[PDB]
Design a binder for these strands. Structure first.
Ligand SMILES: [Ca+2]
Ligand SMILES: [Mg+2]
Ligand SMILES: [Mg+2]
Length: 430
DNA sequence: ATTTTGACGCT
């Protein structure tokens, strides 16, 4: 009752660039705009692996992870842009730099947590308070929310998508109590106004469109963001949670898409997030551990406390390459040459990072996979990263991994290596 | 033969 927390203390948004690598390539090459197109890495093996797909091409069934040759079977007019290749490997610099463009714009509005190359959480609580004080009891016009969906509306006593969107927004705004500045629904609504402004600024200043979710925590904001894509934003209120979760597969909630969510489904014999409400906190802790159990107990009620962390920059800078099938590295010279390629890309990115961001990495992590091992990484070792020098870093990585070679032959490497991975970590201010 | 990333939890 009067003491039960409701998780309505913050306004949190999640902003997600639509088909991001595709938009970067479409901005650069106008011939690709408004066409079925995809971004592909490499080209020799089956036309290359697709890593991003425009919504026009998704309509044909083209997906990420698909080989371009197969996608062309679904979509014969599919246009393709290739990721740059440098030093023998795919090089993602263009997309990292485009990401910085967008994150710097978002940071003008509020504190952001970089969640991936194309998405960030936004803590809007303070910005909403200030905007509410500026408004001075003035109602919020639908014109301030031209791309916003209110999840769960319209309801109760038009057959077009935009007409439905507007009907629901009208019902929401008609019900709103705009004179209580502490009202969580009003706070979410002002948050959505700010996110419309943020998304307009991103599009004006970069050309890139994005979607967004606005709710009271990160998990609900992330879920909301996916409800109406592309180029739209969705407000998920606390009150919408019971209906939304009542048919929501557990795997759709962030962190439950893998083994833990599978165990929740199997052990409890349920399918939907809302079904979790029927268990006590102790029951859930008994099955899934103290932390996970408490988290699930709160989350199925719409409540999550994970903070938006103030972190706009990645914590690690890494470079990796797979060597599948017959290309697995089987000689020492091969291993050393590719460690050098990876180390040279790493040195370039690290020097740029030091100049831009006033920090230096202090640890070098070396990871390899051996042929036959099902795990993505077979071995991980660390060593000191004391100089931004590619020859030193590659020599050090070889030193820490050279004892993995079973081969009694000096020149040969066995078992063959199917993956090399160098990662700079443990940054310190510089 | 997806590939190339990135963050965080466990012990
Ligand atoms: Ca995206
Ligand atoms: Mg995606
Ligand atoms: Mg994303």
């Amino acid at each position: 009752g009067p003491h039960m927390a409701t998780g309505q203390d913050r306004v949190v948004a999640l902003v997600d660039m639509d088909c991001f690598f595709v938009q970067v390539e479409q901005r650069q090459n106008p011939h690709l705009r408004n066409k079925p197109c995809a971004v592909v890495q490499y080209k020799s093996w089956k036309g290359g692996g697709i890593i991003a797909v425009s919504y026009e091409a998704r309509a044909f069934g083209v997906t990420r992870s698909m080989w371009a040759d197969d996608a062309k079977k679904l979509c014969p007019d599919l246009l393709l842009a290739q990721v740059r290749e440098s030093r023998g490997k795919a090089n993602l610099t263009k997309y990292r730099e485009a990401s910085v463009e967008v994150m710097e714009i978002m940071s003008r509005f509020a504190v952001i947590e970089r969640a991936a190359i194309d998405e960030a959480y936004v803590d809007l609580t303070s910005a909403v308070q200030e905007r509410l004080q500026k408004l001075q009891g003035q109602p919020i016009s639908a014109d301030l929310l031209p791309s916003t969906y209110i999840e769960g509306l319209p309801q109760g006593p038009t057959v077009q998508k935009e007409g439905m969107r507007k009907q629901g927004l009208f019902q929401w705004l008609d019900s709103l109590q705009i004179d209580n500045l502490t009202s969580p629904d009003l706070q979410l609504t002002v948050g959505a106004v700010i996110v419309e402004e943020m998304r307009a600024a991103i599009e004006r200043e970069t050309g890139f469109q994005c979607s967004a979710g606005i709710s009271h925590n990160k998990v609900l904001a992330k879920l909301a963001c996916g409800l109406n894509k592309p180029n739209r934003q969705t407000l998920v209120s606390h009150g919408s949670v019971p209906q939304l979760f009542s048919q929501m597969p557990i795997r759709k909630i962030r962190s439950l898409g893998g083994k833990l969510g599978a165990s929740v489904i199997e052990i409890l014999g349920i399918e939907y997030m809302g079904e979790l409400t029927q268990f006590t906190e102790s029951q859930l802790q008994s099955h899934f551990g103290e932390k996970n159990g408490s988290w699930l107990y709160a989350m199925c009620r719409g409540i999550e406390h994970d903070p938006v962390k103030p972190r706009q920059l990645p914590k690690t800078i890494g470079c990796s390459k797979n060597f599948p099938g017959k290309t697995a590295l089987a000689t020492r010279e091969q291993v050393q040459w590719w460690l050098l390629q990876l180390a040279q890309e790493l040195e370039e990115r690290l020097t740029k990072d030091r100049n831009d961001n006033d920090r230096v990495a202090t640890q070098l992590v070396v990871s390899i996979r051996v042929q036959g091992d099902k795990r993505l990484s077979s071995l991980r070792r660390c060593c000191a990263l004391t100089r931004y020098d590619a020859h030193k870093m590659s020599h050090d990585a070889f030193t820490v991994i050279k004892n993995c070679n079973t081969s009694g032959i000096q020149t040969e490497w066995s078992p063959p290596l199917t993956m090399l991975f160098l990662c700079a970590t443990k940054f310190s201010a510089s």
